Amino acid sequence: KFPRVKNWELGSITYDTLCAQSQQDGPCTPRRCLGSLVLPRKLQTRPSPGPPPAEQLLSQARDFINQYYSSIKRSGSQAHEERLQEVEAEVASTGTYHLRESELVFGAKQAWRNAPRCVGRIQWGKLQVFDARDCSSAQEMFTYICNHIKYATNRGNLRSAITVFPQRAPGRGDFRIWNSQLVRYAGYRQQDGSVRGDPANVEITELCIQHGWTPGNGRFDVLPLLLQAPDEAPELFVLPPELVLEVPLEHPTLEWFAALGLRWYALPAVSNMLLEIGGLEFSAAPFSGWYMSTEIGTRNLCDPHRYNILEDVAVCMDLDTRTTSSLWKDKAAVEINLAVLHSFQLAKVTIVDHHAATVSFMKHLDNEQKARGGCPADWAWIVPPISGSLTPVFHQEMVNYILSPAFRYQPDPW
Amino acid sequence: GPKFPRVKNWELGSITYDTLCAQSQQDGPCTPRRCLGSLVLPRKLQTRPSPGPPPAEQLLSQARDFINQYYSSIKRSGSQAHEERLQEVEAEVASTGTYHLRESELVFGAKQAWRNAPRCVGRIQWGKLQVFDARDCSSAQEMFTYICNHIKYATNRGNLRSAITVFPQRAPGRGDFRIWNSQLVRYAGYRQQDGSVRGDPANVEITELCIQHGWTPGNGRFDVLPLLLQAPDEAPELFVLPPELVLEVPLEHPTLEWFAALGLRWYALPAVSNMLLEIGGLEFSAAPFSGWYMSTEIGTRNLCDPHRYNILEDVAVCMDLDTRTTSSLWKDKAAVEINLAVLHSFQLAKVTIVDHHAATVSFMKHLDNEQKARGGCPADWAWIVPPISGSLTPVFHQEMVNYILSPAFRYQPDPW
Ligand code: HEM
Ligand code: HEM
Ligand SMILES: N=C(N)n1cc2cccc([N+](=O)[O-])c2n1
Ligand SMILES: N=C(N)n1cc2cccc([N+](=O)[O-])c2n1
Ligand SMILES: O=[N+]([O-])c1cccc2cn[nH]c12
Ligand SMILES: O=[N+]([O-])c1cccc2cn[nH]c12
Ligand SMILES: [Zn+2]
C-alpha cells in the first residue's frame, strides 16, 4: 500500500506514507492514468447546488481543527475540545461554520504546502495572509486587492501573500475575481483574425470591453479587473498604473534584443482558484509569490498559443530557421530566458531561475519526508518547461495525491 | 458527454475522447487515491519469472484475446479460420500447457507491441518493423549469430532499419533464453580506486560480470562491452562483437572547433536487449529490438545526466561560461550545443538520426492516425516530452492517457 519512491540520480529510496492521509479521489484508476490532464471533468469544485451533507462537512471540519491544534502543540487540550464543540454547535444549527483568523492563516499555509504542482513550496511557511472576509462590495474587494498588490510588490522585493474574501454560502452567489491573474495583458482580436497582445486573454479582454472598458491597441496593455460581489453583475476597476510594476526586457550581450520592446509584470497573482479549508470554500482568494524565470521566458513568451516570439528572436539572431535540426528554437529560448533573468535582476525585482528553484524543491522534499513522511508532487508540473533532465527533480520519482487544505479549480463565473 | 477520458490539446484547443483504453486488460500502478504515473519501474508489469506456466485458464483467455486481435487485423473475425485457430490453440494448451504462434501471428504481435508502447515517441514507424524469427535457435553461439545478423541488417551502413529478433519463448520447466546486456551496444563502466567511474557509470555491474565471466577489460571511456548470452539452463557464454559491425560516430561541433578535441563519440544502433516481449500470454524473454536514435537521448541523457557521462561542466568551461551561478544558464547553453553536436556529427556521417522537434511532430501525426484507427493511443507524457526544450515541442501541450495494452514490451528481473 505504501509507495516506494526512488531517485535515479542518487540511488536513494523513500516511502510515501503521507498519501495515506488522502481522503479525496483523483482522476486515475488502475485501468488508466490521467495524471497528464490539466483539469478534471468533475473533481472540480461544483457550485454548491445546496448545503453540503452536515455529516460530510462536520467530518472535514473536525479533521482540520485537529490538524490545527496539532500544529500549535495543544492537541487534546481544553481549547481543542471546546473548539470542536463550537464547530459542531454551528454546523448543527446553521449548516456551516466559520474559521478563526489564526485557523484561516494555518489553513492557507497548508493549502500552499499541499499544492502538488507548485515548485516553490519551500517558502510555504512565509505567507502574508490578509483576512478580507469583512467585505460586502466589489468596491471593497478592489481596495483589498490594491493593498495586497502594494504589499506583495514591495518595490521589487516581492513577498508572498494571499487575500481571502468571504467564503461561499448556500443559495447565494459567490464573490469572484473574473480575471485568472490580478495582472494580465489584453488580447485584442484583430480583423485579420490574428491577435494583438496575449492570445490567451481574448475572451476576458472581451468581457471587459463588454462592461464598458476603453480598450487600447498595444501588445502589453494591463487589463482592468472585473470584481463580482454576490449575485451582482461584475464591476470594472482600473489598476492604478504605479501599483503595477513592470520589467522592460533587454539582453546582456545582444544589443538589439531591447529593440524588440518586450516586457512583463513583476507580480504573478493567481486569482481564479478556489481555496478550500475544512469543508469551507473560498471562491475568491488571490495569491502570489514571485516568478520562476521559465514561466515568462518559456511559457508566456514562447508558447505557440501565447506571444509566440521564437521565430522573431531566431531571425534577429540570424539563425537557420529552415530546419528543426539547427536547434534554432532551443537556442532562441535559452536567450529569451536569459534576457528575463538579466532584466529582472537589473530592475532589482525578485525572481528565481529554474535550476535554483528545483534545487530548493529537492530540499523541500527532504524536509517534508521527515516532517510528514512524504510530499504530494505532480512531476509534469515540477519539472521546468525547458532543460527538464538538466534539473534534479527530473530524476526524482513522485507520488501525486490530494491533501486538504487545498487549492482547487472552479468554473469560470460566466 | 461520453463515458471516456476527454483529452485536450491546449495549443490547438481541440478535443478527443480515448475509447481505446477500454480495451486494457492489465492494471497500472495508479488508484483514485494517488497517481504513481511518474514511477520508472511500476512493480506491475515486471514479469517476475513465474515458477510454473501461467494458470491454464489465465493463459487461455490471454491467448484467445490475441488470436481475436490477429483475425480482426486481417478482417476475418468470426470466420471459419478464426474459430479453428481458437480450437487449435486451446487443444494445444490442453495437451501441453502452452502453445505456439504462427509466423504471421508473431510478426503481427511484434508490431502491435511496439505500437502499444506508451513511452515511445517514434511509433509513427510501427508498421515498418522487420521481424526476424529466431525461435529455432538452440545455443548461445547461435544467439550470437542472429544478434550479429540483426546488427548488420539494422545498421545497414548508416541507413538504419527498425528490427527485432525473436528467440524461443519461455517453456514450462526449462531455462529462459536471456541476453544479460541491457543493450546490444553499450560502453563499459570501469570502477576506479578513487571511487569514480571511467566510461559509463550506468554499466559498472554489467562490466564487472563480463570480467568475472572471462572478459579481459580495457581502460577507455568508450570501450564496447562484449555480449553475455544465455541459452536455457546453461551458464551465460561471453561473446565479443566484431568491431567492424559496431558503427560509431565521433562527435564534433559545427562552429566550436575545439569540441572534436573532447574525443567524445557514440554508437549508431540503439538496441534494447533486456525487455520481455509478451504476446497472447506467451513470454519471449530474449527479443532485442532496435530502430534509430532521437538526438536528445544521446546529447542530453547519456552525455549530460549527472549519473552518466556528466559532461555538462567540462563543455561549459570550454565555452567559457560562468559555472559558478545558476542564473547564467550555463547548463542550458552547454546542453543545447552538445545536442547540436550530436545532430551534426550523425548527419555528417550519414547515420540516421532524428531531432526532438521532428520526432515530436511526427508523433502528433501518429496520434491523429491512431485516434481514427483505434480511438486513442496510450502515451506516457513524461516520456514522450523530450528531456530538453519541453514546451517548445507540440507534444508538451497535448494531454495523454496512459494504459497498458498487449502485445507489449515489459521490464523483467535481471537473470542473475
Ligand atoms: C514564492 C514563489 C513561488 C514560485 C517561484 C512558484 C512557482 C510555481 C510554478 C512554476 C508553478 C507551475 C506553473 C506551471 O508549470 O504552469 C506553480 C504552481 C502553483 N503554485 Fe506556486 N510558486 C510560488 C508561490 C506560490 C504561492 C504563494 C502559492 C499559494 C499561496 C502558490 C500556489 C501554487 C498553486 C496552487 C499552483 C498550481 C496552479 C495551477 O494548477 O495552475 N505558489 N508555482
Ligand atoms: C524508429 C525509431 C525509434 C525512435 C526514435 C524511438 C525513440 C524512443 C525514445 C525517445 C524512447 C524514450 C527514451 C526515454 O525517454 O528514456 C523510446 C522508448 C521505447 N521505445 Fe522507441 N523508438 C524507436 C523505435 C523503437 C522500436 C523499433 C521499438 C520496438 C520494436 C521501440 C520500443 C520502445 C519501448 C518499449 C520503449 C520504452 C523503453 C523503456 O521503458 O525504457 N522503439 N523510444
Ligand atoms: N524520459 C524519461 N526517461 N523519464 C521520464 C521520467 C519520469 C519520472 C522520473 C524519471 N526519472 O526518474 O528518470 C523519468 N525519466
Ligand atoms: N507544467 C505545466 N503547465 N504542464 C504539465 C502538463 C502536462 C500535460 C499537458 C500539459 N498541457 O497541455 O499544458 C501540461 N502543462
Ligand atoms: O511561475 N510562478 O512564479 C508562479 C506560477 C504559478 C503560480 C504562482 C504563484 N507565485 N508564483 C507563481
Ligand atoms: O532514443 N531512442 O532512439 C531509443 C530509445 C529506446 C529504444 C529505442 C529503439 N530505437 N530507438 C530507441
Ligand atoms: Zn496516474
Swiss-Prot record, chain A:
Phosphorylation of Ser-48 by CDK5 reduces activity. The modification Phosphoserine is found at S48. Zn(2+) binds at C28, C33. Coiled coil: none annotated. L-arginine binds at Q181, W290, Y291, E295, N300. Residues 32-414 are annotated as: Interaction with NOSIP. (6R)-L-erythro-5,6,7,8-tetrahydrobiopterin binds at S36, A380, W381, F394. Heme b binds at C118, Y409. It is found in: Cell membrane; Membrane, Caveola; Cytoplasm, Cytoskeleton; Golgi apparatus. Produces nitric oxide (NO) which is implicated in vascular smooth muscle relaxation through a cGMP-mediated signal transduction pathway. NO mediates vascular endothelial growth factor (VEGF)-induced angiogenesis in coronary vessels and promotes blood clotting through the activation of platelets. Belongs to the NOS family. Homodimer. Interacts with NOSIP and NOSTRIN. Interacts with HSP90AB1. Forms a complex with ASL, ASS1 and SLC7A1; the complex regulates cell-autonomous L-arginine synthesis and citrulline recycling while channeling extracellular L-arginine to nitric oxide synthesis pathway. This is Nitric oxide synthase 3. It comes from Bos taurus (Bovine). The gene is NOS3.
Swiss-Prot record, chain B:
L-arginine binds at Q183, W292, Y293, E297, N302. One of its GO terms (molecular function) is metal ion binding. Keywords: Blood coagulation, Calcium, Calmodulin-binding, Cell membrane, Cytoplasm, Cytoskeleton, FAD, Flavoprotein, FMN, Golgi apparatus, Heme, Hemostasis, Iron, Lipoprotein, Membrane, Metal-binding, Myristate, NADP, Oxidoreductase, Palmitate, Phosphoprotein, Zinc. GO terms for cellular component: caveola; cytoskeleton; cytosol; Golgi apparatus; nucleus; plasma membrane. (6R)-L-erythro-5,6,7,8-tetrahydrobiopterin binds at S38, A382, W383, F396. It is found in: Cell membrane; Membrane, Caveola; Cytoplasm, Cytoskeleton; Golgi apparatus. Produces nitric oxide (NO) which is implicated in vascular smooth muscle relaxation through a cGMP-mediated signal transduction pathway. NO mediates vascular endothelial growth factor (VEGF)-induced angiogenesis in coronary vessels and promotes blood clotting through the activation of platelets. Belongs to the NOS family. This is Nitric oxide synthase 3.
